Amino acid sequence: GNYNYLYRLFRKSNLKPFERDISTEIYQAGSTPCNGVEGFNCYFPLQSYG
Amino acid sequence: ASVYAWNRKRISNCVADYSVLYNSASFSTFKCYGVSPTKLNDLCFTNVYADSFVIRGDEVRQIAPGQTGKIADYNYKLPDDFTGCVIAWNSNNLDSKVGGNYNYLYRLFRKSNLKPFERDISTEIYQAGSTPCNGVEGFNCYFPLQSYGFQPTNGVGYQPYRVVVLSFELLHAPATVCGPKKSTNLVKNKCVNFNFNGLTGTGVLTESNKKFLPFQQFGRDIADTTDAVRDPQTLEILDITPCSFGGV
Amino acid sequence: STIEEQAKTFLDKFNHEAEDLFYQSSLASWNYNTNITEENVQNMNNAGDKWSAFLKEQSTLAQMYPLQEIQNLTVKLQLQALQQNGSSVLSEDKSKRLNTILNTMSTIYSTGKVCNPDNPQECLLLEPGLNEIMANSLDYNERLWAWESWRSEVGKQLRPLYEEYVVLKNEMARANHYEDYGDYWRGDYEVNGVDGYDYSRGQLIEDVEHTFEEIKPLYEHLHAYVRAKLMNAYPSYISPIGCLPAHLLGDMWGRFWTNLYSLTVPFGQKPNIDVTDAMVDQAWDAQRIFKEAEKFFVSVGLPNMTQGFWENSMLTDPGNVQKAVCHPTAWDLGKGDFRILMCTKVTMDDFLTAHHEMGHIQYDMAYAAQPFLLRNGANEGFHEAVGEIMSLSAATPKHLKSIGLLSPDFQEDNETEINFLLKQALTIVGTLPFTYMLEKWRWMVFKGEIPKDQWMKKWWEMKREIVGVVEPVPHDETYCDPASLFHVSNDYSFIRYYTRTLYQFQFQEALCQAAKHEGPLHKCDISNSTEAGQKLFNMLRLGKSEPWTLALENVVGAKNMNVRPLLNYFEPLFTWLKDQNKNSFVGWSTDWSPYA
Ligand SMILES: *[C@@H]1O[C@H](CO)[C@@H](O[C@@H]2O[C@H](CO)[C@@H](O)[C@H](O)[C@H]2NC(C)=O)[C@H](O)[C@H]1NC(C)=O
Ligand SMILES: *[C@@H]1O[C@H](CO)[C@@H](O)[C@H](O)[C@H]1NC(C)=O
Ligand SMILES: *[C@@H]1O[C@H](CO)[C@@H](O)[C@H](O)[C@H]1NC(C)=O
Ligand SMILES: *[C@@H]1O[C@H](CO)[C@@H](O)[C@H](O)[C@H]1NC(C)=O
Ligand SMILES: *[C@@H]1O[C@H](CO)[C@@H](O)[C@H](O)[C@H]1NC(C)=O
Ligand SMILES: *[C@@H]1O[C@H](CO)[C@@H](O)[C@H](O)[C@H]1NC(C)=O
Ligand SMILES: *[C@@H]1O[C@H](CO)[C@@H](O)[C@H](O)[C@H]1NC(C)=O
């Protein structure tokens, strides 16, 4: 698996096209906020294709 | 009911509140696969058949689409790309008794794998080898049905977690039942947008002397212009008129 | 239509059936050790009989499966343990002498008697009566009376019973296609069915004997030093040219030398590390004993304790009528149920025992994902040695100063560490020659190449060699003093204590090298190191599913039983002992030379 190309999985809001979204922020679906510690609802978007 | 005798009841022609479940603060495996909790509120899906069964705590994760194991293979098989959610919560304080609760059984051995959405209730015994079993216990009969033991002092993994499964799918059947949409407050005599049960528009409210029959919802007067609505929430009449507009 | 798929069907049926019956027997046995009543003895015997009869039916069904075509090793180890016939080979007239004899011995051993004949004043039980007279008094005359108060009143009625026991249980092994009953206990270390990875049963004897030639030079200097600091209390009663008396070595058998620390302290002028008086001024409760223990494990990386232990176990001594025994044992009830059974006290030993017995619990849930027949240790020495490596780390001065129990300004000179290290040397190095010799004696009476008139002449000739005691009066063959010890009488394999030390120090050097500690092993610590968690956790999850010889290659890289990483722990002690023994005659043969 060539784990060198990543992509964004979830994003809270739709942005203006032709705009770069370079951020390590984590998705917020549930009511419990995530403060950098992975939990049941943090949903770290970044993932590497195989 | 047990996992081998899971019931399937149809939920339709009613209103389902999905917001109360979110803030219950009691579930342990409230997970949604293939659908977001937010998107099922504004729009819904018909075919809301519900499945209820008892799953051991350590093997709760086995019940999910694309996940294989023991219970998911011989007791309850979920189809691929299952558009639904699973909600599980503990039942230690009620679904247990001293000495072992020998009332929940499950199917351990099956000759063939279970296809999606199929219930297999039968008293036939397993065939490990080739010699047939004529109802007499032997070296290769291996009676499949087994009873779990849920003592009050058992570990967290072995506790019977109360879990239910909801299935959402779209067949050709129309007229689905959907989650309720929050209301708002009332405003009088203002050019304000509105979206009643089916129709939307903008205008000002004014009194009217005429009366309408009680079995209508809205109406139009001349050239497909909607000019009358009646919300059933309060059983009071408010009539709409277009607000002022013109060329400067 | 294959035997391979038929065995997986049977083991899947057995795993769910046995874990239901084992939990009922374990719960009944748990209630016997907490709430003793008259009916609770019957309640334990009811569940224990149906559990033993359950294994009789499952062993007969697994016998018909041939073992010559199962290439899978996970089910091969399960079928080898399940197919142990045990008592099914014996006849009905022979099976009834097992349950009768084993229950009479336990009740006889539970009778405590130290009342002197022809003077019946009073005598208490073992815990209140025997321990105070052996750990505090310093009188030669009454301890000599106490030696004949136990070796002439309990072991005299075992001579016709124990000799009948060792000639028919040895014959069962040939009916089970084993060599002897001593070879049956070596089946736990036996590995078969893998090409090039096989460990013979007879290889353990050769490897154990090869490692004994480096334990001896460490023990020669330990016995020479302790005989000079013991003659202070007995000036004209022992000569500093020979060996030591047997009834002055801490215990009745001399297994543990813990009671000689007060008599043979190296440097008693500076105060010892003792905070027992400090905790009672601030009111330290038993809730706090387990709270700091739980956060110690999660800082390493091990999972914390479950919620079904705090509200289920007992902590203090409850009530007044509950007279239940709280002997230190580890409980594995199964089905995720884990308990700790002890009487808490604000002492040095009970705080360390609280750390020692929790380590077995953390090992027990590690292989919880394994099947029930493989829900055990890799051998009999792993499950005991894992629970003792954390006792060595918690006793270090660095860990005591880490929490804040010790004073922030406590210097660490030479003498503050040798006093602590010699206490560990007396309880670990001193018990290795005593543990191996007794099991070596048990091997010859179980093999059967020892006649009736040659029991005592071989048992006594190693006491003259290893311990070094000349008999003050000749004794004949009617005594049965070797069967009096607690482990040999209760059917416990004593070889697990010899291999406990060589395992608890192989792992200590491996985890300290993983944590990259800069210093010697006595000051090393395990906490605050997630690198050390992967070394322990990779070997804990194996259980009995992998051979134990692969577990060594997973930590040290050497497939054999290494003895080298044990002398390196005692290099600071050995070099001081070599300078102290410059003029003394170190290394005794049998010696009647001075007082012939
Ligand atoms: C191991 O880690 C713990 C946790 O950080 C250390 O405890 C801290 O020690 C410092 C200095 O002694 C204190 O200021 C902190 O308050 C302690 N932490 C907590 C949460 O109380 C501990 O010292 C470390 N071990 C060693 C040997 O340094
Ligand atoms: C529905 O209408 C009735 C009219 O009888 C009213 O009493 C009720 O309050 C309405 N529902 C809500 C939720 O207000
Ligand atoms: C504890 O033992 C006493 C008698 O020793 C008995 O009366 C009581 O019922 C027991 N309680 C439990 C919970 O076993
Ligand atoms: C036998 O089957 C088990 C089942 O998981 C597997 O782990 C093991 O590797 C198999 N043995 C061989 C030799 O393939
Ligand atoms: C166990 O007993 C059965 C029945 O007596 C016998 O066929 C089998 O060979 C025995 N196996 C061993 C290892 O003793
Ligand atoms: C035990 O560990 C789990 C997982 O790290 C954690 O969620 C839980 O809070 C811990 N328990 C306590 C009492 O801290
Ligand atoms: C320990 O002994 C050595 C050798 O005599 C000595 O040099 C050293 O100073 C001693 N330690 C202390 C703290 O004095």
Contact criterion met (CB < 8 Å) for B142 and C338: no
Contact A31, A40 (CB under 8 A): no
DSSP assigned state of C199: B
B158 touches chain C (CB under 8 A): yes
Do residues B52 and B114 touch, judged by C-beta distance below 8 A? no
Residues in B touching C12 (Cβ below 8 Å): 108-109
C527 alpha carbon, closest ligand: 1
> H or E stretch including A48?
strand A47-48
User: Is residue C227 within 8 Å of residue C240, measured between CB atoms?
Assistant: yes
For C243, C532, C551, the CA distances from C538, given in Å and listed in that order, are 46, 10, 9
Which residues are B193's β-sheet partners?
B202
CA C237 from centre of chain: 34
B204 - beta bridge partners? B241
Packing angle between helix C506-514 and helix C530-540, nearest 10 degrees? 140
Tokens, residue C537: 């956790």
How far apart are alpha carbons C385 and C505 in whole angstroms?
A: 9
Q: From the CA of C325, how far away is ligand 3's center (Å)?
A: 14
Quickly count: other Cβ atoms within 10 Å of residue B32's Cβ.
18
Q: What domain range is C158 assigned to?
A: 1-596
Alpha-carbon span A18 to C314, nearest angstrom: 66
User: Measuring from atom 2 of ligand 7, which residue has the nearest CA?
Assistant: C414
| Distance in angstroms (rounded) separating the CA atoms of residues C168 and C177 | 15
Q: How many CA atoms lie within 13 A of C26 on its CB side?
A: 21
What does the block give as tokens for C511? Answer: 């985890």
Which helix (H) or strand (E) covers residue C224, if one does? helix C203-226
Q: How far apart are CA C107 and CA C295, in angstroms?
A: 42
CB B111 within 8 A of CB B148: no
Please give the sequence-ordered ranges of beta strands (E in DSSP) within chain B, or none if there are none. Answer: 7-9, 31-33, 50-56, 84-90, 105-106, 146-147, 160-167, 192-195, 200-206, 218-220, 226-229, 239-241
From residue C480, alpha-carbon distances to B189, C161, C240, C341 in Å are: 110, 10, 32, 34
Task: List Cα–Cα distances, C410 to C176, C272, C347, C395, C398, in angstroms.
Answer: 61, 11, 21, 16, 11
Q: Is C4 on the interface with B (CB under 8 A)?
A: no
Q: Residue A48: count other Cβ atoms within 10 Å of its Cβ.
A: 11
Give nearest CA residue, ligand 7 atom 3.
C414
- Whether the Cβ atoms of residue C443 and residue C423 lie closer than 8 Å to each other: no
* B155: contact with C, CB 8 A cutoff: yes
With a 6 A CB cut-off, is C402 part of the ligand 1 pocket?
Answer: yes
Angle at C481 between CA C480 and CA C486, to 5 degrees: 115
Helices (H), C110-200: 131-135, 140-150, 159-168, 172-175, 181-185
Chain centre to alpha carbon of residue B217? 30
Ligand 4 site residues (CB inside 6 A) read: C 71-74
Maximum Cα–Cα distance for chain C, whole Å? 82
From residue B45, alpha-carbon distances to B26, B35, C289 in Å are 25, 11, 55
Number of residues assigned to chain C: 596
Report yes or no: C374 and C488 within 8 Å, Cβ to Cβ: no
Is C94 part of any known ligand binding site?
no
**Are chains C and A in contact at 3+ CB pairs closer than 8 Å?**
no
Measure C415 CA to ligand 7 centroid, in angstroms: 9
Q: Please say whether the beta carbons of B65 and B82 come within 8 A.
A: yes
Q: What's the alpha-carbon Rg for chain B, to the nearest Å? A: 27
Count Cα atoms within 13 angstroms, Cβ side, for C31: 16
Q: Which two tokens stand for residue A37?
A: 């510690």
Distance from Cα C347 to the centre of ligand 1, integer Å: 25
CB atoms within 10 A of CB C176: 14
Resolution of this model in Å is: 3.8
Q: Which residues of C280-289 are buried (b: 16+ CB within 10 A; e: fewer)?
A: eeeeeeeeeb
Using the mean position of ligand 1's atoms as its centre, give its distance from the Cα of residue C404 in Å: 10
- Closest to C252 in 3D by CA, of C139, C106, C151, C105: C151
At C80, list the tokens.
Answer: 């080898």
CA separation for the pair C531, C234 (Å, rounded)? 51
Interface test with C, best of B158, B159, B161 (most C CBs within 10 A): B158
Please tell me the distance between residue B88's alpha carbon and the centre of ligand 6 in angstroms: 20
Q: What is the DSSP letter of C115?
A: P
Ligand 1 pocket mutation, candidates C296, C402, C517, criterion most atoms within 8 A of CB = C402
Which listed ligand is nearest to C194 at the C-alpha? 4
Bridge partner list, B163:
B53, B88
Q: Is C567 exposed, middle or buried (0-12, 13-18, 19+ CB in 10 A)?
A: middle
Taking CA atoms, C498 is separated from B55, C47, C215, C217, C503, in Å, by: 45, 34, 11, 17, 9
B4 Rama class: left (phi>0) / alpha (psi -120 to 50) / beta? alpha
CA distance C336 to C3: 32
**Cβ partners under 8 Å of residue C567, min gap 6:** C214, C218, C574
Cα separation, C436 vs C210, in Å, equals 13
Ligand 4 center–CA B211 separation, angstroms: 82
C-beta of residue C18 within 8 angstroms of C-beta of residue C372: yes
Task: Say how far apart CA C244 and CA C221 lie, in whole Å.
Answer: 14
The answer to whether the beta carbons of residues B79 and B117 sit under 8 Å apart is yes
Q: What 3 state SS string does B58-83 have?
A: HHCCCCCCCCCCCHHHHCCCCCCCCC
Q: Taking Cα atoms as reference points, which of B83, B79, B101, B75 lies closest to residue B6?
A: B75
Phi and psi (nearest 5°) for C183? Answer: -70, -25
Q: Which tokens go with C283? A: 């009111």
- Nearest residue (by CA) to ligand 3, atom 12, is C35
Kindly report the length of chain A.
Answer: 50
Cα C339 from Cα C323, distance rounded (Å) = 19
Rounded CA separation B228/B216 (Å)? 10
Q: Tokens 């078969």 sit at which residue?
A: C192
Cα–chain center distance at C335: 26
Residue type, C290: F
Confirm if C294 and C306 have CB atoms less than 8 A apart. Answer: no
Q: Quick check: B109 and C9 in contact, CB under 8 A? A: yes
Say yes or no for a CB contact (<8 Å) between A31 and B22: yes
Burial label, B61 (beta-carbon count in 10 A; 0-12, 13-18, 19+): middle
Token readout for C454 is 């040659």
Q: Hunting for tokens 């109802």 — which residue is that?
A: B135
Cα C540 to Cα C383: distance, rounded to the nearest angstrom: 10
Question: Which residues face C74 on adjacent strands?
Answer: none
* Contact C414 CB / ligand 7 (< 6 Å): yes
Whether chain B has a CB inside 8 Å of the CB on C115: the answer is no
Phi-psi category of C520—alpha, beta or left, where left has phi over 0 and alpha has psi -120 to 50? Answer: beta
**B8: which strand partners?**
B51
Distances (CA, A) of C449 to C78, C147, C180: 33, 31, 11
Which residue's CA is the closest to the ligand 4 atom numbered 2?
C72
Which one of B234, B236, B237 would you pick to mutate in the ligand 2 pocket, going by the greatest count of ligand atoms within 8 A of its CB?
Answer: B234
> How many CB atoms lie under 10 A from the CB of residue C580?
15
Residues B177, B18 contacting (CB under 8 angstroms): no
Name the DSSP letter for residue C576: H
Counting Cα atoms < 13 Å in the Cβ hemisphere of C582 gives 3
For residue C72, the 8-state DSSP code is -
Centroid of ligand 5 to alpha carbon of B133 (angstroms) = 25
Pocket test for ligand 4, best of C8, C73, C75 (most atoms within 8 A of CB): C73
Partners of B138 on chain C (C-beta within 8 Å) are none
Give the integer Cα–Cα distance in Å for C308 and C64: 41
Q: Any idea of the CA torsion for C110, C115, C121, C124, to the nearest 10 degrees? A: -30
Q: Which of C288, C426, C272 is nearest to C351 (CA)?
A: C288
Beta-sheet strands, E only, within C304-442: 329-334, 337-341
Residue C310: closest C-alpha in chain B: B153
**Residues lining ligand 5, judged by CB closer than 6 Å?**
C 63, 85, 88-89, 175-177
Task: Specify whether the backbone of B189 is left (phi greater than 0), alpha (psi in -120 to 50) or beta.
Answer: left
Cα separation, B204 vs B191, in Å, equals 5
CA–CA separation, C464 and C243 (whole Å): 10
Q: Do chains C and B touch (3 or more CB pairs under 8 A)?
A: yes
Strand order across the B200-206 sheet: B192-195, B200-206, B239-241
CA C111/CA C154 separation, integer angstroms: 9
Structure-block tokens of residue B245: 């507009």
Element spanning A47, H or E: strand A47-48
- Chains B–C, number of C-beta pairs less than 8 Å apart: 58
Please state, in angstroms and as integers, the Cα–Cα distance from residue B61 to each residue in B95, B210, C370, C373, C492, following that order: 20, 62, 18, 24, 41
CB of C413 within 6 A of ligand 7: the answer is yes
CA distance B153 to chain A (A): 27
- Please classify residue C8 by burial: count the beta carbons closer than 10 Å to its beta carbon, then call 0-12 exposed, 13-18 middle and 19+ buried: middle
Does residue C590 contact residue C596 with C-beta atoms inside 8 Å? no
Would an 8 Å CB–CB cutoff place B18 in contact with chain C?
Answer: no
Q: Is C337 on the interface with B (CB under 8 A)?
A: yes
Tokens coding C475: 């004794």
Q: What angle do CA C10, C16, C19 make, to 5 degrees?
A: 125
∠ CA C439-C129-C490, nearest 5°, is 30
Rounded Cα distance, C226 and C577, in Å: 11
| C383 annotated as ligand-binding | no
Technique behind this structure?
A: cryo-EM
Closest ligand 5 atom to residue C83 Cα is 13
Tell me, using a 6 A CB cutoff, whether residue C575 lines ligand 7.
Answer: no
Q: Which residues lie closer than 8 Å to B95 by C-beta, 6 or more apart?
A: B54, B101, B150, B160, B162
Q: What residues pair up with B87 in beta bridges, in sequence order? A: B164
What does the alpha-carbon distance between residue B143 and residue B139 come to, in Å, rounded to a whole number?
A: 11
Token pair of C385 as six digits: 């040695």
What are B's interface residues with A at a Cβ cutoff of 8 A? Answer: 22-23, 36-38
Q: What phi and psi, each to the nearest 5 degrees, are found at residue A6?
A: -110, 175
Q: Tell me which DSSP letter residue B219 carries.
A: E
CA of A22 to nearest chain B CA: how many angstroms apart?
A: 24
Helix axis angle, C382-394 to C495-504, nearest 10°: 50
Gap between the Cα atoms of C250 and C248, Å rounded: 6
| Chains touching B by CB (3 or more pairs below 8 Å) | A, C
For residue B240, list its beta bridge partners. B205
Concatenated DSSP letters for C249-294?
Answer: SSSSSSS--GGGTTTT-S--SSPP---HHHHHHTT--THHHHHHHH
Catalytic site positions of C: 357, 487
Looking at the structure of chain C, the number of domains it has is 1
Residue C324's CB is within 10 A of a number of other CB atoms, namely 18
CA of C329 to the centre of ligand 3 (A): 22
Instruction: Please list, in sequence order, all residues whose beta carbon lies within 8 angstroms of the beta carbon of residue C463, skipping any fewer than 6 positions away.
Output: C469
| C151 is an annotated ligand-binding site residue | yes
B67 to B79, B81, C239, C342: CA distances (angstroms):
10, 11, 77, 43
Asked if C368's CB is within 8 angstroms of B156's CB, the reply is no
Buried b (16+ CB within 10 A) or exposed e, C59-96: bebbeebeeeebeebbbebbbbebbeeeeeebeeeeee
Any binding-site annotation on C223?
A: no
Q: Which two tokens stand for residue C573?
A: 């002690």
Residue C462 CA to residue C434 CA, distance in Å, equals: 10
**Residue C486 near residue C109, CB atoms below 8 Å:** yes
Give me the sign of the Cα torsion angle C249, C251, C256, C260. Answer: negative
Q: Tell me, yes or no, whether chains A and B touch by having 3 or more C-beta pairs under 8 A.
A: yes
C372, C19 contact by CB (below 8 A): yes
Residue keyed to tokens 């190296």: C266
CA B172 to chain centre: 19
The partner residue sitting opposite B139, judged by closest CB among C16, C64, C335, is C64
In Å, how far from its chain's centre is CA C248? 22
Task: Tell me which chain B residue has its CA closest to the CA of residue C333.
Answer: B154
CB contact under 8 A, A31 and B23: yes
3-state class (DSSP) for residue C360: helix
Question: What does the alpha-carbon distance between residue B180 and residue C198 come to, in Å, rounded to a whole number?
Answer: 69
Classified as helix, coil or strand, C416 is helix
- Torsion sign, CA atoms C34, C35, C37, C41: negative
Cβ within 8 Å, pair B149-C27: no
Length of chain B: 248
Enter the tokens of residue A13: 């809001």
Residues in contact with C383: Cβ distance below 8 Å, sequence separation at least 6, in sequence order = C360, C363, C376, C377
**Best mutation site among C528, C529, C530, C531 for ligand 1, i.e. most ligand atoms within 8 A of its Cβ?**
C528
**Helix boundaries (H) for C64-126:** 73-82, 92-109
- In three-state secondary structure terms, C38 is helix
C459: annotated binding-site residue? yes
**CA torsion through residues B208, B210, B215, B217, sign:** negative
